[PDB]
Curated annotation (Swiss-Prot), chain A:
Residues 1-299 are cytoplasmic. Cleaves the C-terminus of replicase polyprotein at 11 sites. Recognizes substrates containing the core sequence [ILMVF]-Q-|-[SGACN]. Cleaves and inactivates human TRMT1, preventing tRNA guanine(26)-dimethylation of tRNAs. May cleave human NLRP1 in lung epithelial cells, thereby activating the NLRP1 inflammasome pathway. May cleave human GSDMD, triggering alternative GSDME-mediated epithelial cell death upon activation of the NLRP1 inflammasome, which may enhance the release interleukins 1B, 6, 16 and 18. Also able to bind an ADP-ribose-1''-phosphate (ADRP). This is 3C-like proteinase nsp5. 3CL-PRO exists as monomer and homodimer. Only the homodimer shows catalytic activity. Interacts with host FBXO22; this interaction promotes the proteasomal degradation of nsp5. It comes from the Viruses. Changing M47A: Does not affect ability to cleave and inactivate human TRMT1. It comes from Severe acute respiratory syndrome coronavirus 2. There is a cross-link at K3, K88 (Glycyl lysine isopeptide (Lys-Gly) (interchain with G-Cter in ubiquitin)). It is found in: Host cytoplasm; Host Golgi apparatus; Host nucleus. Changing L203V: In strain: Zeta/P.2. Inhibited by pyridone-containing alpha-ketoamides compounds 13a and 13b. In turn, alpha-ketoamide 13b (tert-butyl (1-((S)-1-(((S)-4-(benzylamino)-3,4-dioxo-1-((S)-2-oxopyrrolidin-3-yl)butan-2-yl)amino)-3-cyclopropyl-1-oxopropan-2-yl)-2-oxo-1,2-dihydropyridin-3-yl)carbamate) inhibits SARS-CoV-2 replication in human lung cells. Inhibited ex vivo by michael acceptor inhibitor N3. Inhibited ex vivo by compound 11a and 11b. Residues 1-299 form the Peptidase C30 domain. The chain holds residues 3266 to 3564 of 4405 of the full protein. It catalyses: TSAVLQ-|-SGFRK-NH2 and SGVTFQ-|-GKFKK the two peptides corresponding to the two self-cleavage sites of the SARS 3C-like proteinase are the two most reactive peptide substrates. The enzyme exhibits a strong preference for substrates containing Gln at P1 position and Leu at P2 position. Changing K88R: In strain: Beta/B.1.351.
Curated annotation (Swiss-Prot), chain B:
It is found in: Host cytoplasm; Host Golgi apparatus; Host nucleus. Cleaves the C-terminus of replicase polyprotein at 11 sites. Recognizes substrates containing the core sequence [ILMVF]-Q-|-[SGACN]. Cleaves and inactivates human TRMT1, preventing tRNA guanine(26)-dimethylation of tRNAs. May cleave human NLRP1 in lung epithelial cells, thereby activating the NLRP1 inflammasome pathway. May cleave human GSDMD, triggering alternative GSDME-mediated epithelial cell death upon activation of the NLRP1 inflammasome, which may enhance the release interleukins 1B, 6, 16 and 18. Also able to bind an ADP-ribose-1''-phosphate (ADRP). There is a cross-link at K5, K90 (Glycyl lysine isopeptide (Lys-Gly) (interchain with G-Cter in ubiquitin)). It comes from Severe acute respiratory syndrome coronavirus 2 (2019-nCoV). It catalyses: TSAVLQ-|-SGFRK-NH2 and SGVTFQ-|-GKFKK the two peptides corresponding to the two self-cleavage sites of the SARS 3C-like proteinase are the two most reactive peptide substrates. The enzyme exhibits a strong preference for substrates containing Gln at P1 position and Leu at P2 position. Residues 1-300 form the Peptidase C30 domain. 3CL-PRO exists as monomer and homodimer. Only the homodimer shows catalytic activity. Interacts with host FBXO22; this interaction promotes the proteasomal degradation of nsp5. The chain holds residues 3264 to 3563 of 4405 of the full protein. Residues 1-300 are cytoplasmic. This is 3C-like proteinase nsp5. The active site is at H41 (for 3cl-pro activity), C145 (for 3cl-pro activity). It comes from the Viruses. Inhibited by pyridone-containing alpha-ketoamides compounds 13a and 13b. In turn, alpha-ketoamide 13b (tert-butyl (1-((S)-1-(((S)-4-(benzylamino)-3,4-dioxo-1-((S)-2-oxopyrrolidin-3-yl)butan-2-yl)amino)-3-cyclopropyl-1-oxopropan-2-yl)-2-oxo-1,2-dihydropyridin-3-yl)carbamate) inhibits SARS-CoV-2 replication in human lung cells. Inhibited ex vivo by michael acceptor inhibitor N3. Inhibited ex vivo by compound 11a and 11b. Changing L205V: In strain: Zeta/P.2.
Length: 299, 300
């Protein structure tokens, strides 16, 4: 069992490099529009308290340099949508895929194509943490890298990298410029909230372990929602809702283990520990596999 | 903090994946130029798997017995030849999406990206390392035979692995692109035993060197040790022995930092005997042995 990432072929052809003055980052080229973080128009001095309205009116069309590999794209207009910058180009992208803009909720997974100066370098799978941050590997020049999901022929763009929080986590927006979490695109002291474990993803991972034949942690006890939740709050586990039970229903029928039945197994794992054992070869309980991910992997 | 396992972009490989069907058997193929590469056991039924006579099976096949599909477009096989455990199908059409490619054979401990595909359609990509017992860790359900492993350098793609079989312990075995098997395995449905899997010691040391550069230093001690002394202790933890070759490879890492390689070995010895005590190294609660010294040096 491994954390698989979606193939990145349809996204690699949409990545471009956007230069404005002395700042260069990554841009998403779809149809005849290039999307990039709005702070590309800011100098280092302006990052303290920028007024993006006054800086954008001063800027003109020839202040933006957009490059798609070896060719040069001509900007014929600029527009601002929340925290994202929309640049109109003269030539439409012939590699534009079937795509849609969507906003996801914390706990959902997606793949990230990390690009440096318009050149893709790596891809990995991650989940939106409950504090609206992502644990990724973005060095300098990776701003504007996009997160995505693939549904057959349709690519769903759901994230764009904006900032780099000092704790190591990163913060971003959706493709419509709406930020994930209480952050602003300013160079100030910002702190991500307390990170917590996604309980529903752990249960889906535990169900995948039973599918793989590993069922030593199963016991004869079953708990209820309120009793398990009080235990969950103690060790910083996200509260379990009724909607989580129905979402995990298909995994319950296949393995034959009820959601509340498996909940008592997770409760014992948090209380008495692992007892020097392993689950799928891991000494820790993974929480970056959504229930939909588990079904896709095997069933 | 944060040193994530990143995989290479798979775009240049996705256009090379095709579907090969012979009789009732179907797996994945690699379409480079005007040649299609696929495992040779595609000419086998479930009954022939116990004791396959590949020379006898292949002599009875004609060109029209192989069906090759690239998307909705079907390719015409005009010839075929066997090279070790791989089948080379010549086709009338050269692949227009062929990138700059090479064939390289890899050693244990090195890393590559795997593109998992089912019936010629890519499904997911992940990063892995070649274990010292010549197996790989992953999730390849049936129909994924023929998936390739690769590294990308600049614009050149280096193919190094082709998935062939599924060992009964959960690990997977395969060959290089010339059809030569990795490790002591054959394309037979018989009792094949993989050796004990050991931690890649040189990869852990390079990972720990990257930890020192990023500011993590809680595991350092003032002690030093010799190569033979560290090796004797290392075997007790199922750790791969360290050789004089590994010492010079880590030389640039031990040059940027102030820690000698044998000094770093002493710290690793103390970690094994003690544990992490709830701490983390680069955001990881466990020692990582899937980052090569080359990757650490390049990424600094």
């Amino acid at each position: 069992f491994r954390k698989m990432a979606f193939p990145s072929g349809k996204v690699e052809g949409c990545m471009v490099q956007v230069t404005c003055g002395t700042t260069t980052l990554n841009g998403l080229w779809l149809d005849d529009v290039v999307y990039c973080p709005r702070h590309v128009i800011c100098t280092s001095e302006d990052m303290l308290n920028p007024n993006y309205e006054d800086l954008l009116i001063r800027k003109s069309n020839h202040n933006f340099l957009v490059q798609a590999g070896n060719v040069q794209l001509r900007v014929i207009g600029h527009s601002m949508q929340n925290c994202v910058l929309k640049l109109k180009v003269d030539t439409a992208n012939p590699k534009t895929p079937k795509y849609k803009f969507v906003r996801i909720q914390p706990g959902q997974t997606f793949s990230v194509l990390a690009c440096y100066n318009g050149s893709p370098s790596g891809v990995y799978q991650c989940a939106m943490r409950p504090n609206f941050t992502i644990k990724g590997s973005f060095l300098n020049g990776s701003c504007g890298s996009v997160g995505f999901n693939i549904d057959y022929d349709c690519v769903s763009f759901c994230y764009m990298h904006h900032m780099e929080l000092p704790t190591g986590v990163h913060a971003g927006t959706d493709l419509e410029g709406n930020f994930y979490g209480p952050f602003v695109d300013r160079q100030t002291a910002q702190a991500a909230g307390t990170d917590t474990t996604i309980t529903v993803n752990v249960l889906a991972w535990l169900y995948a372990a039973v599918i793989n034949g590993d069922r030593w942690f199963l016991n004869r006890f079953t708990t209820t929602l309120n009793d398990f939740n009080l235990v969950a709050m103690k060790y910083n586990y996200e509260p379990l809702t009724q909607d989580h039970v129905d979402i995990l229903g298909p995994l319950s029928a296949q393995t034959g283990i009820a959601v509340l039945d498996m909940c008592a197994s997770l409760k014992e794992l948090l209380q008495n520990g692992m007892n020097g054992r392993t689950i799928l070869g891991s000494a820790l309980l993974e929480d970056e596999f959504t229930p939909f991910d588990v079904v896709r992997q095997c069933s």
